[PDB]
């Protein structure tokens, strides 16, 4: 007799013609398990901002002193409850572009671009401290910035140059303080018509304080706008200010990288060594699809919104039916005088095992797809980015679903076609699947017929 294997497995699959089908085997392609656990990637521990954001970490917020020793990392992690950034009220100018640049860097080195004690002899560096930037009981200020006030009633026009001999890009940060009263402006920087000029060889911006009465944020009616720029190797940046200058104390020598990124996550940090890292938790999987989270770091499976992506490897588990008795092979040869296998179908099985490899390799893995941040004046670009992400996600979800459904249909047609072909080869009779023989066919005769070469006219 000729039939097909049927095991006790109950893995279900869906196709276009009918759904929820039951077959003898399956191979899931959607990995829906996350460790829930932040682990280092490629042996490099991440940088956990913790209670701070990128602005607070870079500016040198007094509550981010654990990050002042950070030199290298695989990916920046900021918790959703990260509000220690920009303690003094004001807006970080091009903050989101700064995050975009920071996502590329893999490591930097924090150095005194202008040493505090040496750089400013004619300006007074000890005075500047604010209650808004309070560390412990005492008031404090940013660790990477320096607030220069007039020394002895005079604020002579400072002119400080730095030549980028570090051999790499240098991220210079400063600020321009906008007081709340003209009296404050005169009391801090004696010149009322103050200005700040920061001119590199490719950066040229001039800032002017704008004294106005504002609502109090964090107990302060003044504002401090923070600016940044990247200094190319072997280049000079000149800081010239007559007042309102929060000079750069420390800068960062950026060593650019690739594959890193910024993820906002809640998962706690422990020790592993993975290849993928979503905010929900680090994962690895050879399966080419994961639904855990769109935002990934490193080598990760493609992200689709689906909930079940199952290839079909086995034949229809539930004319001849399933051969529960024989578990030896996908195909059986029942003997009147147990089901056996044939070598001519192992090649087809290997072809299917190659086919699953083909479909998984045709889905090129997704690389670092960290989200972008936009301000309240970039809702158009934010919605364009959202539309792009959602359109690509929908297209790849639809592509994955089409591929699984058409592949399951094609492979089920395969599992029927090969069975029918084997029936023909055995022929070359009861239609249920068995082969009645008028001649006496012993077990040796059955094996010879299984070889496909039998002399039917011999019996006559």
């Amino acid at each position, epitope marked *: 007799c000729i039939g097909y294997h049927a095991n006790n497995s109950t893995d279900t699959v869906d196709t276009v013609l009918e759904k929820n089908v039951t077959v003898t085997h399956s191979v899931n392609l959607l990995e829906d398990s996350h460790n829930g656990k932040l682990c280092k990637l490629k042996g490099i521990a991440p940088l956990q901002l913790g209670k701070c954001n990128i602005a607070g970490w870079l500016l040198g917020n007094p509550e981010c002193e654990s990050l002042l020793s950070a030199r290298s990392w695989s990916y920046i992690v900021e918790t959703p409850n990260s509000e220690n950034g920009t303690c003094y009220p004001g807006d970080f100018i091009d903050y989101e572009e700064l995050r975009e640049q920071l996502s590329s860097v893999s490591s930097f080195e924090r150095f005194e671009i202008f040493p505090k004690e040496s750089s400013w002899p004619n300006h007074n560096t000890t005075k500047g401290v604010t209650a808004a930037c309070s560390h*412990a009981g*005492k008031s404090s200020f940013y660790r990477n910035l320096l607030w220069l006030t007039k020394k002895g009633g005079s604020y002579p026009k400072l002119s400080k140059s730095y030549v980028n001999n570090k051999g790499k890009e240098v991220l210079v940060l400063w600020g321009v303080h906008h007081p*709340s009263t003209s009296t404050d402006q005169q009391s801090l920087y004696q010149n009322e018509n103050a200005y700040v000029s920061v001119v590199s060889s490719n950066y040229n911006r001039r800032f002017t304080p704008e004294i106005a009465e504002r609502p109090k944020v964090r107990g302060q009616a003044g504002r401090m706008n923070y600016y940044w720029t990247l200094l190319e190797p072997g280049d000079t940046i000149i800081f010239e200010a007559t007042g309102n200058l929060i000079a750069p104390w420390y800068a960062f020598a950026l060593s650019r990288g690739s594959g890193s990124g910024i993820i906002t996550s809640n998962a706690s940090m422990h020790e592993c060594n993975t290849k993928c890292q979503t905010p929900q938790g680090a994962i690895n999987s050879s399966l080419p699809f994961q639904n855990i989270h769109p935002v990934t770091i490193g080598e990760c499976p493609k992200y689709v919104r689906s909930t079940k992506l199952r290839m079909v490897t086995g034949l229809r588990n539930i004319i001849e039916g399933g051969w529960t008795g024989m578990i030896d092979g996908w195909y059986g040869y029942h003997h009147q005088n147990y089901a056996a296998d044939q070598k001519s179908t192992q090649n087809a099985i290997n072809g299917i095992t190659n086919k699953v490899n083909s479909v998984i390799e045709k889905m090129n893995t997704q690389f670092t797809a960290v989200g972008k941040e936009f301000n309240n004046l970039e809702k158009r670009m934010e919605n364009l980015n959202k539309k792009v992400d959602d359109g690509f996600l929908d297209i790849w979800t639809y592509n994955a679903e089409l591929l699984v459904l058409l592949e399951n249909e094609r492979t089920l047609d395969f599992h029927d076609s090969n069975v029918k072909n084997l029936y023909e080869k055995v022929k070359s009779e009861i239609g249920n699947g068995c082969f009645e023989f008028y001649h006496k066919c012993d077990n040796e005769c059955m094996e010879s017929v299984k070889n496909g070469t039998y002399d039917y006219p011999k019996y006559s």
Partner: antibody
Amino acid sequence: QVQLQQSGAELMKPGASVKISCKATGYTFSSYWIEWVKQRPGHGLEWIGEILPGSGRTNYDERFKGKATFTADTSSNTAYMQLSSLTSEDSAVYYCARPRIYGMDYWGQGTSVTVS
Amino acid sequence: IVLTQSPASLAVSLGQRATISCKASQSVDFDGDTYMSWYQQKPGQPPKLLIYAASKLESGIPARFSGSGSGTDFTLNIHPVEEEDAATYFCQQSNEDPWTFGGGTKLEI
């Protein structure tokens, strides 16, 4: 519920050394500074210095340089102030206080040192 | 910094407004914030913070304790006084690092 325990009363002859003990309760010991302030009758309250527990960074008033040395034990939540070579001119009552931006809100009971 | 105070001793009857003037050698308001504190000290007890920022009232301190002033002129006004208000009063500046205190004033009944 924050409390700052202090040691009892101590007395030593001039030229001795004393390790004044301050014990902080109810909050992260290293998080806030521990200020040291000296009070003498007829002279008011004078700031001796400060020590940030755990960090090790400390500041001293200029007039107390060398006279006062601060150490911290973050394991026991205890802050210690040391006076070396006590003189009759340095007899007072010493407080350990938790600073806030504008002033010290939480204080200790205080310890008085004599020179006889 | 140097931070003077006046009067050295204050004699105010019960139910009478008591004003204590603290003056500073240097201005103690930086960036529109006044770093000034007001303390009261029972004898043999640590000082208690009453007015911080020279105008803000401390939590747990009644509305009678009120102060004001900015720059180098600061006043603490007590009204109406009570038998418990008899204490030595301290003004402290936090703008300068020495965090110098005031002389202290005795208020009687």
